[PDB]
């Protein structure tokens, strides 16, 4: 039994354009452990991306946090691209 990751994309603080913030991608509830996660700015991979180590839930699934410092704009599009054995192709989840 394989569990597909839950992908949540949200900012550290209530967002406002022109003010510095942190974009988070929280990937959880997945099984097995192998996963690939990237943050994207207008379709391209963000280089300076920090993350937590793989983490363990009591239900035996895994979770991780990927984040980056960013200044949101009205024109800029941000997303989180995730890949796992349950996915045929990498899933791109947009920051809403």
């Amino acid at each position: 039994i394989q569990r597909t990751p839950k992908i949540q994309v949200y900012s550290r603080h209530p967002a406002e354009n022109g003010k510095s913030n942190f974009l988070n991608c929280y990937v959880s509830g997945f099984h097995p452990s192998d996963i690939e996660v990237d943050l994207l700015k207008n379709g391209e991979r963000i280089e300076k991306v920090e993350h937590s180590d793989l983490s363990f839930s009591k239900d035996w699934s895994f979770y991780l946090l990927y984040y980056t410092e960013f200044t949101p704009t009205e024109k800029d599009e941000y997303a989180c691209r995730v890949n796992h054995v349950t996915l045929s192709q990498p899933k791109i989840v947009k920051w809403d």
Partner: protein
């Protein structure tokens, strides 16, 4: 305040490129405290208050124990795969731990999973193992035949685990025993024509344990809940939505009401 100490072990057979065949991580509540894997083969702190209060001999001794626990997990996952007649990559997991409750009472648990599913659950009050199937029942019969190891495990869960947790709570008090109250706001908005959505949003709070609920004229009641998410700065965020209304928020002994 309630606190818990947990240690996880993850074993992966035939791992694909970039996956350790063994990982072991310790936590105090939701904070990582220790790490080990089959690639580094080193036991390391994962919190600065752990690095600062434990002498280098701690990590040297646990490096050796973890190297042995790694070998043990490898061999148990092979016996399991042979019992199920499985080939390919499979996972084996362990979770051990204890809780210090707010009334001073305690809990303890020791569980095993095979391919991310419940497999064996220890009962320290009867010193017995609860098996999910025939394979686990075969394993349980072997494990239950060693009475001294069952007694050891009970002692470890009830005394040793609580003693470590108390030590770590003291080491990391400025982190673990702190409280960052929530920033809570209620937002109203007409969504679908004739439909009004009430959103109660909390952020910047620590610890992550919070109670959020919508009341109608002071009494109970279809609510949507948002997960308690880490904000990345050590604090957390959550929400609850509905369609006289009031949001009730309880965090670290403080009750908060936001009337609409």
């Amino acid at each position: 305040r309630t606190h818990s100490l947990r240690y996880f072990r993850l074993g992966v057979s035939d791992p694909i490129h970039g996956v350790p065949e063994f990982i072991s991580v310790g936590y105090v509540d939701s904070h990582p405290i220790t790490t080990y894997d089959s690639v580094t083969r080193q036991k390391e702190p994962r919190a600065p208050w752990m690095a600062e209060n434990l002498a280098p001999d701690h990590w040297e001794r646990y490096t050796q124990l973890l190297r042995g626990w790694q070998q043990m997990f490898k061999v148990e996952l092979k016996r399991l795969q042979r019992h199920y007649n499985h080939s390919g990559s499979h996972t084996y997991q362990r979770m051990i731990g204890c809780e210090l409750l707010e009334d001073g009472s305690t809990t303890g648990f020791l569980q095993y999973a095979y391919d991310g599913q419940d497999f064996l659950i220890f009962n320290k009050d009867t010193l017995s193992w609860l098996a999910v199937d025939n394979v686990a029942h075969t394993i349980k019969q072997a494990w239950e035949a060693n009475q001294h190891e069952l007694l050891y495990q009970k002692n470890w869960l009830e005394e040793e685990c609580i003693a470590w947790l108390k030590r770590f709570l003291e080491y990391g008090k400025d982190t673990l025993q702190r409280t960052e109250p929530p920033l809570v706001r209620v937002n109203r908005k007409e969504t679908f024509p004739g439909v009004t959505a009430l959103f109660c949003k909390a952020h910047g709070f620590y610890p992550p344990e919070i109670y959020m609920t919508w009341m109608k004229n002071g009494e109970e009641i279809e609510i949507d809940y948002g997960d308690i998410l880490p904000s990345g700065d050590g604090t957390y965020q959550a929400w609850a939505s509905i369609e006289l209304y009031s949001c009730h928020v309880e965090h670290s002994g403080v009750h908060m009401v936001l009337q609409v």
